[PDB]
Amino acid sequence: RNIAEAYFQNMVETATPLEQIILLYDKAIECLERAIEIYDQVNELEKRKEFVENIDRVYDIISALKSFLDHEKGKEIAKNLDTIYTIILNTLVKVDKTKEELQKILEILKDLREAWEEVKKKVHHH
Question: Which stretches are annotated as coiled coil (predicted)?
Answer without folding.
Answer: 92-122
